[PDB]
Amino acid sequence: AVQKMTRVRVVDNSALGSTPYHRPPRCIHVYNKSGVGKVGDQILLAIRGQKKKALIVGHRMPGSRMTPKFDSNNVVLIEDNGNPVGTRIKIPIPTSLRRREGEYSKVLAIAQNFV
Amino acid sequence: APWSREAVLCLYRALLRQGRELRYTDRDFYFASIRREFRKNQKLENLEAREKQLEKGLVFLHSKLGGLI
Amino acid sequence: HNIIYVNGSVPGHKNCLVKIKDSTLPAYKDSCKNLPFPTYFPDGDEEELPEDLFDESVWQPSEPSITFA
Amino acid sequence: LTLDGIKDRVLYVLKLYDKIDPEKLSVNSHFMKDLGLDSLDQVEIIMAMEDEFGFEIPDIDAEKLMCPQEIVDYIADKK
Amino acid sequence: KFDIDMLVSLLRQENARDICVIQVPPEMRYTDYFVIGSGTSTRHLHAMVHYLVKMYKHLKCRSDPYVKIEGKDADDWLCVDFGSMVIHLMLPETRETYELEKLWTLRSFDDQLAQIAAETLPEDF
Amino acid sequence: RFLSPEFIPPRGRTNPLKFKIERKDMLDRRKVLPIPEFYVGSILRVTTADPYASGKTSQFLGICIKRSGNGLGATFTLRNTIEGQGVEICFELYNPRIQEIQVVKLEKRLDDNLLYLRDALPEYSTFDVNMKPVPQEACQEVPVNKLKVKMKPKPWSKRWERPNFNIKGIRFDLALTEEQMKEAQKWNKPWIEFDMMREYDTSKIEAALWEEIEASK
Amino acid sequence: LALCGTVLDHLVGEETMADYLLYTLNRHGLFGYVQHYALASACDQIEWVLKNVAIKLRKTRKVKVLTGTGNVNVIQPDYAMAARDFLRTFRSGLLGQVMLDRDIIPA
Ligand SMILES: [Mg+2]
């Protein structure tokens, strides 16, 4: 459950998410009518003095049975047009992104591993 | 540098040979793309670097051309 | 055992008496058309009912594992 | 068979190939040195040569041809 | 019916410059087929995406549900996720940047995926 | 005689008939799908069909860290680390889309709950995905793995050193000073283990169930 | 204006201000921050230069880093404290005489 001011991990190969500038990116906004962000929910990110959109692909909060609970809050950086900023994702991504309402096919194309 | 430079030639021959029968994929593009892959990487490499590059190409040959149809 | 399986929660604690009657919602206005109109009489026994009656969507136990084919 | 047919056809298929510039497309045109073609390039020349005539041979001497007349001669004795 | 053969033929008819079809292994659970198609301009991408969607609804799919068109906000990459097939359409420049074909052809030997590395974090001193 | 935990009824005011109805459905599923014997700490491989995909199943391998639930709602959680990312999935035993449950390695651990493995070093949670099952011997007891894991820096998901958790599988000496172990014991509640009204005897209940399960077979 | 001290560095970011200071200081050729702080050949990456100065001042923090397996507190060189001190020496004037408006508005 990502909220405002939560520290999140950029699970991507994009330059902005690299370990330099150790300060973790923090959530500024959750694009939901509730402010709670779950898997598949977009958020606005404070990263390296920039404001960038990100998509939640994993979090530590328990979900419904038969679904993966991760050890970190993961996100992928998204361009304003909606194209992913990074070109590869190596960490496992839950398969539930496929069905839920939204535009997630672009991200799934980038990720080899699904869990 | 490679496991054997003849194996590099053998790998390229098979890839073109396998691509000859592709129908759904754009045969012309596949031939051009393979040329770019071979030229960009293989021109300059070391023993370890070339071995890894050749190994990935070998997987492509034995994996039904990486699922290409 | 005369057990009804009802979706969701019912007011009250376990072992408490409840009142159950056909739904008064407009969508299910006339459902008694295909139900025992006064009531179900075991005395008539036109056809002895199975021990368990199921809804079509319900996946019965002892069925094969659900594969979304 | 048309031995000269192979020469012109080899000359023609090589002429069709666009990457090589037919600055000197003689019957004795070398590939490693005269045309500056690498091991990668010649194989594709084999495919173009093979495609026209129908292959039926391995790379045993296709690599060794190194010139149109040699392959023409090699295509000359295989048919 | 709407099948791989029909889809490629429809793409061919409307002059898709570059077409690649990858049969994803069943072990990978994403989809049966993966298709990538290049297009000259954003106008061309929209037309073919709309054309295929119109044909898909026309071509049976009575039991199968409808498909959303994704990426209309973007000007260079459109992807439609049919049940058994996913088609990603993009302009030339976008294609080389992402290089989707290498990722799905070389499952785990992709060059960019290889460049990425794992880390551990002990104290500085 | 290994009675699966789900069959044991929890104490309360519920009618025993509610359990008979649930058991009949549970046993019917066990006929279609065989649910193997396993304990917390054993490595399991579970095959499940994905609704998102079409007729395409998925396999997950991990160590079982918790068993909970009674009746048809029984669940178990198993953990693993994949490309350096820890993942846990909670599985419903009787979910119809579980194709197979395979006990890759049957073993028991010092504690019946292994949620502290989240705070232990990654090695203790990483398991090879393609590992083949190890042989098991019927004429034996279940092997009790007595490994005591090493914990990472003190900030933990829970205060495992505290007496309530009753953790016996952590190397507390390496991670905690003798004073900290002393300071923890202020939470000890020693009287808990000696008050006889907090103990639920299931020996007779477990006994009667065993023949009933066998009788149906 | 942030470099001049007009803006309270905490609503602009010490790190971002530090990067601009290094960016301007290198362009103007005033490599006087490589002698106050031993930086050898000098650099253009703020993270690298901030690493060295933090070492020179023997400052360390316990910082929560977010990794795949969870959150761990790791002792780290103090980049923020380095940025604050690096700006201070610039403000005192020991890092050289700077005219910011030289480049954009030379007129
Ligand atoms: Mg907590």
From Swiss-Prot, chain A:
One of its GO terms (biological process) is mitochondrial translation. GO terms for molecular function: structural constituent of ribosome. It is found in: Mitochondrion. It comes from the Eukaryota. The keyword Transit peptide applies. GO terms for cellular component: mitochondrial inner membrane; mitochondrial large ribosomal subunit; mitochondrion. Keywords: Mitochondrion, Ribonucleoprotein, Ribosomal protein, Transit peptide. The keyword Transferase does not apply. Signal peptide: none annotated. Component of the mitochondrial ribosome large subunit (39S) which comprises a 16S rRNA and about 50 distinct proteins. Interacts with MALSU1. Belongs to the universal ribosomal protein uL14 family. May form part of 2 intersubunit bridges in the assembled ribosome. Upon binding to MALSU1, intersubunit bridge formation is blocked, preventing ribosome formation and repressing translation. This is Large ribosomal subunit protein uL14m. It comes from Mus musculus (Mouse).
Curated annotation (Swiss-Prot), chain C:
Component of the mitochondrial ribosome large subunit (39S) which comprises a 16S rRNA and about 50 distinct proteins. This is Large ribosomal subunit protein uL3m. It comes from the Eukaryota. It is found in: Mitochondrion. Belongs to the universal ribosomal protein uL3 family. It comes from Mus musculus (Mouse).
Curated annotation (Swiss-Prot), chain E:
Keywords: Mitochondrion, Ribosome biogenesis. GO terms for cellular component: cytosol; mitochondrial matrix; mitochondrion. GO terms for molecular function: mitochondrial large ribosomal subunit binding. One of its GO terms (biological process) is ribosomal large subunit biogenesis. Required for normal mitochondrial ribosome function and mitochondrial translation. May play a role in ribosome biogenesis by preventing premature association of the 28S and 39S ribosomal subunits. Interacts with mitochondrial ribosomal protein uL14m (MRPL14), probably blocking formation of intersubunit bridge B8, preventing association of the 28S and 39S ribosomal subunits. Addition to isolated mitochondrial ribosomal subunits partially inhibits translation, probably by interfering with the association of the 28S and 39S ribosomal subunits and the formation of functional ribosomes. Belongs to the Iojap/RsfS family. This is Mitochondrial assembly of ribosomal large subunit protein 1. The gene is Malsu1.
Swiss-Prot record, chain F:
It comes from the Eukaryota. Signal peptide: none annotated. The modification Phosphoserine is found at residue 4. One of its GO terms (biological process) is mitochondrial translation. One of its GO terms (molecular function) is structural constituent of ribosome. Disulfide bonds: none annotated. The keyword tRNA-binding does not apply. It is found in: Mitochondrion. GO terms for cellular component: mitochondrial inner membrane; mitochondrial large ribosomal subunit; mitochondrial ribosome; mitochondrion; nucleus. Keywords: Mitochondrion, Phosphoprotein, Ribonucleoprotein, Ribosomal protein, Transit peptide. Belongs to the bacterial ribosomal protein bL19 family. Component of the mitochondrial ribosome large subunit (39S) which comprises a 16S rRNA and about 50 distinct proteins. This is Large ribosomal subunit protein bL19m. It comes from Mus musculus (Mouse). The lineage of its organism: Eukaryota, Metazoa, Chordata, Craniata, Vertebrata. The gene is Mrpl19. The chain holds residues 74 to 290 of 292 of the full protein.
